[PDB]
Amino acid sequence: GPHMVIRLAASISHEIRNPLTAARGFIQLIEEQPLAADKRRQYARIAIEELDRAEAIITDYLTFAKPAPETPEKLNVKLEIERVIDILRPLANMSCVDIQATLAPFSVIGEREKFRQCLLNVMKNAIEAMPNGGTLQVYVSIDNGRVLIRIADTGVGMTKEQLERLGEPYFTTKGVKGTGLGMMVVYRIIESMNGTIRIESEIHKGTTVSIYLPLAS
Amino acid sequence: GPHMVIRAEKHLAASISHEIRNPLTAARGFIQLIEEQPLAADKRRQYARIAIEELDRAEAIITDYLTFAKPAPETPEKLNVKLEIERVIDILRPLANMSCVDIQATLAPFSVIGEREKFRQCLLNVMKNAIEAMPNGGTLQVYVSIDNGRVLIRIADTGVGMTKEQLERLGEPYFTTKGVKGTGLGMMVVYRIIESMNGTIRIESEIHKGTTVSIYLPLAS
Amino acid sequence: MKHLSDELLIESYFKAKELNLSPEFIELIEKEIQRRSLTHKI
Numbered sequence: 378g379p380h381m382v383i384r385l386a387a388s389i390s391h392e393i394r395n396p397l398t399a400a401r402g403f404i405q406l407i408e409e410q411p412l413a414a415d416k417r418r419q420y421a422r423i424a425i426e427e428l429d430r431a432e433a434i435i436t437d438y439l440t441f442a443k444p445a446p447e448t449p450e451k452l453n454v455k456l457e458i459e460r461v462i463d464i465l466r467p468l469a470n471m472s473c474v475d476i477q478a479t480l481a482p483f484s485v486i487g488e489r490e491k492f493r494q495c496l497l498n499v500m501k502n503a504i505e506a507m508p509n510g511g512t513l514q515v516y517v518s519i520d521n522g523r524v525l526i527r528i529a530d531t532g533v534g535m536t537k538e539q540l541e542r543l544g545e546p547y548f549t550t551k552g553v554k555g556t557g558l559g560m561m562v563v564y565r566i567i568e569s570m571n572g573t574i575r576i577e578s579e580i581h582k583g584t585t586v587s588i589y590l591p592l593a594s
Numbered sequence: 595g596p597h598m599v600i601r602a603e604k605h606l607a608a609s610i611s612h613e614i615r616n617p618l619t620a621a622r623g624f625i626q627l628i629e630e631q632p633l634a635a636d637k638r639r640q641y642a643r644i645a646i647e648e649l650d651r652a653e654a655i656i657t658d659y660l661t662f663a664k665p666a667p668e669t670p671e672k673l674n675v676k677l678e679i680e681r682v683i684d685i686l687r688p689l690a691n692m693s694c695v696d697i698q699a700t701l702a703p704f705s706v707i708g709e710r711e712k713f714r715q716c717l718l719n720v721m722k723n724a725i726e727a728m729p730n731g732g733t734l735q736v737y738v739s740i741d742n743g744r745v746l747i748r749i750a751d752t753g754v755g756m757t758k759e760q761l762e763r764l765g766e767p768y769f770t771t772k773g774v775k776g777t778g779l780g781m782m783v784v785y786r787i788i789e790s791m792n793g794t795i796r797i798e799s800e801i802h803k804g805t806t807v808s809i810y811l812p813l814a815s
Numbered sequence: 816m817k818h819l820s821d822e823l824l825i826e827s828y829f830k831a832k833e834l835n836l837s838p839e840f841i842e843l844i845e846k847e848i849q850r851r852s853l854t855h856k857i
């Protein structure tokens with residue numbers, strides 16, 4: 378049976394500094410185990426794990442962010458999606474994901490970097506839901522006066538419990554590689570653009586994310 | 595004095611991910627060398643040291659760009675400049691103490707329109723520079739007043755100052771007099787934030803005497 | 816650091832203090848020690 382949902386995190390510095398603090402400390406402890414190669418190796422492994430955590434946070438929050446305040450802009454949705462797709466294209470390969478893009482050059486008002494971040498987080502989740510093969514569908518249309526972007530995957534899907542918790546800060550099913558912060562920023566960005574989001578999913582079958590945005594002239 | 599130089603009211607840096615990922619990648623790479631096979635103690639020590647220096651770099655970029663940034667997109671608000679300045683001073687008090695810098699603040703609760711995190715980031719970058727210009731003691735003066743319909747935020751130090759050529763280059767991406775610990779990205783950010791707030795900046799500086807940064811912002815009513 | 820043994824965790828804690836590692840790093844270790852209900856070893 379399919380289900381559908383209709384729609385505190387730490388500051389960015391705290392979120393990134395936490396793992397970097399841990400990595401720095403364990404790196405410095407390596408030389409404090411001069412007789413135990415296994416303890417040195419464990420320290421190094423933890424440090425690397427924490428550095429990978431930092432990298433995951435950067436991916437979720439800062440993939441496109443530039444060191445300058447953004448200004449709201451008329452965004453060509455087709456072009457923005459294509460660039461995000463180009464970035465995730467190597468990730469779709471290796472995991473055998475077929476990207477099918479039916480797009481239209483409609484315009485919405487937003488901030489380019491944040492909008493790209495929002496799109497990346499949704500699409501990356503879709504690819505990660507299909508670890509050993511699948512199909513990624515990106516579709517642009519007008520739905521009752523508004524720009525509809527829907528992102529469908531044939532992946533692992535979500536139960537009702539998981540789906541209702543989707544976007545809750547730190548909720549993840551991906552273990553150490555998960556942050557549970559990617560969808561949270563998707564929601565925040567969509568809200569700021571005066572949009573809405575629907576997520577339909579069924580376990581083992583897949584997930585469809587529907588983004589609704591006001592049409593710009 | 596006669597060495598006084600001024601920068602009157604009114605290119606190209608890496609994206610934030612690129613700037614942080616460069617040192618992070620290197621740190622991971624060096625620790626990966628230690629992890630993947632048993633190395634002799636001299637190489638482990640060296641690789642760990644380089645990794646830590648690269649983590650120092652990441653932390654400097656985080657400081658310049660992301661000290662206050664929250665994952666939620668910001669909305670402009672009515673900002674109490676006294677409260678915001680006090681928050682920034684609180685954060686920098688340990689650093690000032692470590693350089694024997696005393697902080698003198700004369701503040702008033704005047705209001706400006708802006709985005710809180712960015713405004714705080716802007717103030718921190720200027721005050722951190724002020725403290726860094728005074729490595730062996732001095733006074734950090736922070737003054738808030740009204741000047742002709744504008745809020746004036748004045749940040750003065752008694753530090754090393756700048757030549758004509760250095761003040762001209764201040765805010766140029768990657769320009770720094772601080773060598774290995776410098777980023778040259780702090781002031782770049784300050785100018786872009788103040789600009790977005792419809793403000794202006796005036797700087798007076800004199801070698802061996804110090805620097806005064808004046809930020810002017812529209813008064814919110 | 817959830818996979819460190821109790822033994823290695825405590826060992827790391829005292830070694831961090833000797834080197835004067837970051838107070839923030841020492842606090843992370845202490846919090847892990849507290850989580851494991853082992854503060855009586857500190």
Ligand SMILES: Nc1ncnc2c1ncn2[C@@H]1O[C@H](COP(=O)(O)OP(=O)(O)O)[C@@H](O)[C@H]1O
Pocket residue numbers: 498502503506530532533534535539543544548549550551554555556557558559560561583584
């Ligand atoms: N397309 C999807 N298919 C299946 N599960 C998903 C999908 N998108 C999100 N989820 C679930 O929601 C959780 C939170 O997502 P997110 O906030 O991006 O964090 P992360 O991806 O780091 O786990 C994921 O761990 C996953 O269980």
Ligand SMILES: Nc1ncnc2c1ncn2[C@@H]1O[C@H](COP(=O)(O)OP(=O)(O)O)[C@@H](O)[C@H]1O
Pocket residue numbers: 719723724727751753754755756760764765769770771772775776777778779780781782804805
């Ligand atoms: N208060 C100050 N006193 C003296 N020099 C300053 C001051 N503020 C900025 N500068 C000069 O401008 C340069 C660039 O500043 P900034 O962009 O913050 O980079 P960083 O502080 O990383 O060097 C500094 O390296 C310094 O030479």
Ligand SMILES: [Mg+2]
Pocket residue numbers: 498501502559560
């Ligand atoms: Mg995700």
Ligand SMILES: [Mg+2]
Pocket residue numbers: 719722723778779780781
């Ligand atoms: Mg600086």
